[model samples]
Target chain A: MATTTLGVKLDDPTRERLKAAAQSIDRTPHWLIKQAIFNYLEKLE
Target chain B: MATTTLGVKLDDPTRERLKAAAQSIDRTPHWLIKQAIFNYLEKLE
Candidate 1:
């Protein structure tokens, strides 16, 4: 699978919240973000 | 608001899926990704 980096622009508060949320769930923010998008699209389909 | 760029690693299939989904809704992938994370976190609260 070819992987690439996408840029996500997040404001300070959202960034902090995302980091904290990921930590609370024992996941990295990066991981949680990918999962978030995956789950989102799955629901849409 | 201090906006910063975060790198999201997406495989080619997921990247294509994300782009298609965003186009289906007439939104940018970047915008949908942020919204996805926002909604995900919101549900946890």
Candidate 2:
């Protein structure tokens, strides 16, 4: 399957927090967000 | 790093919703909760 990027804008504080959490888990913030959206949407499906 | 499990108890509707979402993405409901928690806490950290 093909994949593409979806961008979202976050405030400074939220952005910093996402960065820190990503570091803790060794994952990129982008990956974390996509997974979040995916899982949330699954609920409606 | 070591890995472990975290158990959660959900009401029937909530549990059904989570499982439905997970099925759409072809993943386990457990995985979605962890990602949701991660992204949520990232906002606070």
Candidate 3:
């Protein structure tokens, strides 16, 4: 069960990149973003 | 050096598990997350 939610605003370019990235990986943008977030936090922590 | 930033809110339960999972491999959670993302992407692609 997931309990966290994020609200973000992205410009056209970044949004496109994210969509493309998701398509390239066959994953949803939401999943990719979440993975990226947790990964960054782990490395930074 | 990276070029993007993602802000997320992680629940404590998830955080702790992530930490433990990372430790089992002697890696940072961040790196593990990144690896998961890339690997998932590659396989799914």
Candidate 4:
């Protein structure tokens, strides 16, 4: 997998919510984002 | 609208082809990528 990824900036509150969700799951924000994408792709299959 | 966007990795050959297509149209690679994404999103809609 590529090490570098691009990301869009979210509003401060949305960013905080995402950060909190990641923390609750004990995952990094990047990992959580990747997981979400992968899960969505799987659902589309 | 967000200024930044996220992207996944493509194989070297795919990247080369995308770059060539962008150059042929006198567009920057980033603009080409953005256009492709916008078109795809529009199609989905």
| Top TM-score hit | 1
Give every prediction's interface RMSD. Answer: 3.1, 13.6, 6.5, 6.5
- Candidate 2 reaches a DockQ of 0.05
Candidate 2 vs candidate 4, DockQ winner: 4
Backbone clashes counted, model 2: 2
CA lDDT of each prediction against the hidden true structure:
0.67, 0.46, 0.51, 0.46
lDDT of 1 by residue, B1-42 (tens): 354677756667877787887788787877766665565556
Model 2 ranges with Cα > 4 A deviation = A1-3, A7-9, A39-45, B1-39, B42-45
Which regions of candidate 4 are displaced past 4 Å?
Answer: A1-45, B1-5
The CAPRI classification for model 1 reads as medium
Give one digit per residue, the lDDT tens place, for model 3 in A1-45.
Answer: 363753333334555555677676576877655654454345534
Runs of candidate 1 with Cα error greater than 4 angstroms are A1-4, B1-3, B43-45
Residue A6 shift from truth in candidate 3, angstroms: 7.7
- Candidate 3 residue B10 C-alpha distance from true site, Å: 4.7
Model 4 lDDT tens row, B1-45 = 342455433435445554665686577877755543333233333
State the lDDT of candidate 1 residue by residue for A1-45, as single tens digits: 344667766667877787887788788877766665565566667
DockQ of each: 0.60, 0.05, 0.13, 0.13
In order, the B-chain TM-scores come to 0.52, 0.45, 0.47, 0.61
Q: How good is the docking of model 4, by CAPRI class?
A: incorrect
lDDT of 1: 0.67
Interface RMSD of candidate 3, in Å, is: 6.5
